[PDB]
Design an enzyme around this catalytic site. Structure first.
Site, mmCIF file in Angstrom:
data_model
loop_
_atom_site.group_PDB
_atom_site.id
_atom_site.type_symbol
_atom_site.label_atom_id
_atom_site.label_comp_id
_atom_site.label_asym_id
_atom_site.label_seq_id
_atom_site.Cartn_x
_atom_site.Cartn_y
_atom_site.Cartn_z
ATOM 1 C CD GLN A 82 -13.071 -49.464 -22.009
ATOM 2 O OE1 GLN A 82 -12.551 -48.620 -21.965
ATOM 3 N NE2 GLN A 82 -14.176 -50.150 -21.503
ATOM 4 C CB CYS A 136 -13.996 -46.210 -20.387
ATOM 5 S SG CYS A 136 -15.917 -45.619 -20.022
ATOM 6 C CG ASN A 194 -9.963 -45.111 -26.420
ATOM 7 O OD1 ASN A 194 -10.568 -45.154 -25.542
ATOM 8 N ND2 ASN A 194 -10.523 -45.648 -27.728
#
Ligand SMILES: *C(=O)([N][N]C(=O)[C]([C][C]([C])[C])[N]C(=O)O[C]C1=[C][C]=[C][C]=[C]1)[N][N]C(=O)[C]([C][C]([C])[C])[N]C(=O)O[C]C1=[C][C]=[C][C]=[C]1
Length: 215
Positions: A19, A25, A182
């Site tokens: 990101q 996110c 993630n």
């Protein structure tokens, strides 16, 4: 519903993204969820556009934060979402430039998991596929994670501050966990992934704000 499942092994997960210096996110979580379902529905695996969401979802705040449910509703109303190629990530807020011809998918709504229900969450990941979730990723122990099932007494189930992707669950050395994807790049955590404790009192709020798109 097996005792263990990893969707990466089933080819329902695109590579790890980053990101950058943008609170997108939520966009990456939404996209990841759509990609699982798109793969499950059509048989193809391609990168959907998080930037499309950042610039176009008016109910969200772009790089300032947002909600995955809002992102899903957008895709439904807009009747589609662009592919990464058709709307590359810049990590900065810009005007909505959704290209109809670069459309790679859409969805017909979304479904939320009963808040705090890790059981239903597992059931959802087993039945449907990768599920979007929000956790507390503020702790220093989270920032520097690398191996083992993550857990920290200091984690706050009420300070949800990071949207992430639940791509599975399993048990390691006796510890049940959630396989989390993630968006801080591959050189973070375990190749961009983190296994977080499961059935450990809804650790870090893992089942507090979860949902999945419906096609
Ligand atoms: C998420 O992005 N969480 N933030 C981060 O991950 C931060 C963002 C900062 C810009 C630094 N880190 C980061 O971007 O760095 C990447 C990185 C880190 C370390 C090493 C390498 C790379 N943004 N948070 C949200 O969107 C939250 C979560 C949501 C799911 C609850 N939402 C929010 O803040 O609400 C916004 C909102 C929307 C609609 C109406 C009112 C408010």
């Amino acid at each position: 519903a097996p005792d263990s499942v990893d969707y990466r092994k089933k080819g329902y997960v695109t590579p790890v993204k980053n990101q950058g210096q943008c609170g997108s996110c939520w966009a990456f979580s939404s996209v990841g969820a759509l990609e699982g379902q798109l793969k499950k529905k059509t048989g193809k695996l391609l990168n959907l556009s998080p930037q499309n969401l950042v610039d176009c979802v008016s109910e969200n705040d772009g790089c300032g934060g947002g909600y995955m449910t809002n992102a899903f509703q957008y895709v439904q109303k807009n009747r589609g979402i662009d592919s990464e190629d058709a709307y590359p990530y810049v990590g900065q807020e810009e005007s909505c430039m959704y290209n109809p011809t670069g459309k790679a998918a859409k969805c017909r709504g979304y479904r939320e998991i009963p808040e705090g229900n890790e059981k239903a969450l597992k059931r959802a990941v087993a039945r449907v596929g990768p599920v979007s979730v929000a956790i507390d990723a503020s702790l220093t122990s989270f920032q520097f994670y690398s191996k083992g099932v993550y857990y920290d007494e200091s984690c706050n189930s009420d300070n949800l501050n990071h949207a992430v992707l639940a791509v599975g669950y399993g048990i390691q050395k006796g510890n049940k966990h959630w396989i989390i994807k993630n968006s801080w790049g591959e050189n973070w955590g375990n190749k961009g992934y983190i296994l977080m404790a499961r059935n450990k009192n809804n650790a870090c709020g893992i089942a507090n704000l979860a949902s999945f798109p419906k096609m």
